[PDB]
Design a protein around this ligand. Structure first.
Ligand SMILES: [Zn+2]
Length: 31
């Protein structure tokens, strides 16, 4: 399944949900 960070105008695509979540940590999650 193709993943994409739709956070504002970020727009980065991943092939793993663990990777998208990892990336998402840059914007939010544990901040
Ligand atoms: Zn992002």
């Amino acid at each position: 399944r193709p993943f994409l960070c739709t956070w504002v105008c970020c727009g980065k695509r991943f092939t793993r949900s663990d990777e998208l979540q990892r990336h998402k940590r840059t914007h939010t999650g544990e901040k």
